[PDB]
Amino acid sequence: MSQSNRELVVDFLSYKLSQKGYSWSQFPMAAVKQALREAGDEFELRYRRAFSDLTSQLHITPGTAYQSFEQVVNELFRDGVNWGRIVLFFSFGGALCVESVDKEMQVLVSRIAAWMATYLNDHLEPWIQENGGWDTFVELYG
């Protein structure tokens, strides 16, 4: 749901910020969150800086509009959606939040969280629901 997904995004972002020494104060569900957290770490374990070019293409500032974020994220889905690419999506948002804080734009993290929820509900849920819903995600990554 719009609320379920919003909560999922905030949890993942908060988890990543915490894990990396940053503040998260700027902000079965438990089974999905845990699975996503682990999926994100697993991926980052293999690719330490896989979104350098992507975040660079966006060069986010308080003046960045959603449409720009959307256009860049669309890059991850050039061949459509799959679970791994959804994990990349979450990981990408986490990296954007980290970068925002490093640039003293911590005000943007809640905004990125909002953009992610919107993008999730709009472009990824259609595929997620068609392929088993989050229960399938848990079944594959849990």
Coordinates of C-alpha atoms in Angstrom, one line a residue:
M1 CA 0.0 0.0 0.0
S2 CA 1.0 3.7 -0.2
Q3 CA 1.4 3.6 3.6
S4 CA 3.0 0.1 3.6
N5 CA 5.5 1.1 1.0
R6 CA 6.3 4.5 2.6
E7 CA 7.1 2.6 5.9
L8 CA 9.3 0.2 4.0
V9 CA 11.2 3.0 2.4
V10 CA 11.8 4.8 5.6
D11 CA 12.9 1.6 7.3
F12 CA 15.4 0.8 4.6
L13 CA 16.8 4.3 4.5
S14 CA 17.0 4.6 8.3
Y15 CA 18.7 1.2 8.5
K16 CA 21.4 2.2 5.9
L17 CA 22.0 5.6 7.5
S18 CA 22.4 4.0 10.9
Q19 CA 24.7 1.2 9.6
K20 CA 27.0 3.8 8.0
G21 CA 27.3 6.1 11.0
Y22 CA 24.7 8.7 10.0
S23 CA 21.6 10.1 11.7
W24 CA 18.1 8.9 10.8
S25 CA 16.4 11.6 12.8
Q26 CA 15.4 13.4 9.6
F27 CA 12.5 11.0 9.5
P28 CA 4.4 -9.6 7.7
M29 CA 5.9 -6.1 7.5
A30 CA 8.7 -7.0 9.9
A31 CA 9.7 -10.0 7.6
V32 CA 9.7 -7.8 4.5
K33 CA 11.8 -5.1 6.1
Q34 CA 14.3 -7.6 7.4
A35 CA 14.6 -9.4 4.0
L36 CA 15.0 -6.0 2.2
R37 CA 17.7 -4.9 4.7
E38 CA 19.7 -8.1 4.1
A39 CA 19.2 -8.0 0.3
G40 CA 20.6 -4.4 0.3
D41 CA 23.7 -5.5 2.3
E42 CA 24.2 -8.5 0.2
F43 CA 24.2 -6.4 -3.0
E44 CA 26.4 -3.7 -1.5
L45 CA 28.8 -6.4 -0.4
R46 CA 29.6 -7.1 -4.0
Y47 CA 29.3 -3.6 -5.4
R48 CA 30.8 -1.0 -3.1
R49 CA 30.3 2.0 -5.4
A50 CA 27.9 0.9 -8.2
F51 CA 25.8 4.0 -8.3
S52 CA 28.5 6.7 -8.8
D53 CA 27.5 7.4 -12.3
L54 CA 23.8 7.3 -11.5
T55 CA 23.9 9.7 -8.5
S56 CA 26.3 11.8 -10.6
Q57 CA 23.7 12.0 -13.4
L58 CA 21.2 13.4 -10.8
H59 CA 23.5 15.6 -8.8
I60 CA 20.7 16.2 -6.3
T61 CA 20.2 19.6 -4.6
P62 CA 17.2 21.1 -2.8
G63 CA 16.1 22.3 -6.2
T64 CA 15.9 18.9 -7.9
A65 CA 12.4 17.9 -9.0
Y66 CA 10.8 14.5 -8.8
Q67 CA 10.7 14.1 -12.6
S68 CA 14.5 14.2 -12.6
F69 CA 14.8 11.5 -9.9
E70 CA 12.3 9.4 -11.8
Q71 CA 14.1 9.7 -15.1
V72 CA 17.4 8.6 -13.5
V73 CA 15.9 5.7 -11.6
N74 CA 14.2 4.6 -14.8
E75 CA 17.7 3.7 -15.9
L76 CA 17.7 0.8 -13.5
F77 CA 14.6 -0.5 -15.2
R78 CA 15.6 -0.3 -18.9
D79 CA 14.8 -3.9 -19.3
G80 CA 11.8 -3.8 -16.9
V81 CA 11.4 -4.9 -13.3
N82 CA 12.7 -7.9 -11.4
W83 CA 13.4 -8.4 -7.7
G84 CA 17.1 -7.7 -8.0
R85 CA 16.5 -4.4 -9.7
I86 CA 14.0 -3.4 -7.0
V87 CA 16.8 -4.1 -4.5
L88 CA 19.1 -1.9 -6.6
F89 CA 16.3 0.8 -6.4
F90 CA 16.3 0.8 -2.6
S91 CA 20.1 0.6 -2.5
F92 CA 20.3 3.6 -4.9
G93 CA 18.0 5.7 -2.6
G94 CA 20.1 4.8 0.3
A95 CA 23.2 6.0 -1.5
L96 CA 21.4 9.2 -2.5
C97 CA 20.6 9.9 1.2
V98 CA 24.2 9.3 2.3
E99 CA 25.4 11.7 -0.4
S100 CA 22.8 14.3 0.6
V101 CA 24.1 14.2 4.2
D102 CA 27.7 14.3 3.0
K103 CA 26.9 17.5 1.1
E104 CA 25.1 19.1 4.1
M105 CA 21.7 18.7 2.5
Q106 CA 20.2 16.4 5.1
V107 CA 16.9 18.1 4.5
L108 CA 16.7 16.1 1.3
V109 CA 16.5 12.6 3.0
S110 CA 12.8 12.9 3.9
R111 CA 12.3 14.1 0.3
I112 CA 14.1 11.2 -1.2
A113 CA 12.0 8.9 1.0
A114 CA 8.9 10.6 -0.5
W115 CA 10.2 10.2 -4.0
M116 CA 11.0 6.6 -3.4
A117 CA 7.5 5.8 -2.1
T118 CA 5.9 7.5 -5.0
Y119 CA 8.1 5.7 -7.6
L120 CA 7.5 2.4 -5.8
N121 CA 3.7 2.7 -5.8
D122 CA 3.6 4.1 -9.3
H123 CA 6.2 2.0 -11.3
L124 CA 7.2 -1.0 -9.2
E125 CA 4.0 -2.2 -7.4
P126 CA 2.3 -3.1 -10.7
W127 CA 5.1 -5.7 -11.3
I128 CA 5.3 -6.7 -7.6
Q129 CA 1.6 -7.5 -7.4
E130 CA 1.7 -9.4 -10.7
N131 CA 4.6 -11.6 -9.4
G132 CA 3.4 -12.7 -6.0
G133 CA 3.6 -9.5 -3.9
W134 CA 6.0 -9.0 -1.1
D135 CA 5.4 -12.5 0.2
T136 CA 7.3 -13.8 -2.8
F137 CA 10.1 -11.3 -2.1
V138 CA 10.4 -12.7 1.4
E139 CA 10.3 -16.2 0.1
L140 CA 13.2 -15.4 -2.2
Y141 CA 15.4 -13.3 0.1
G142 CA 14.0 -14.0 3.6

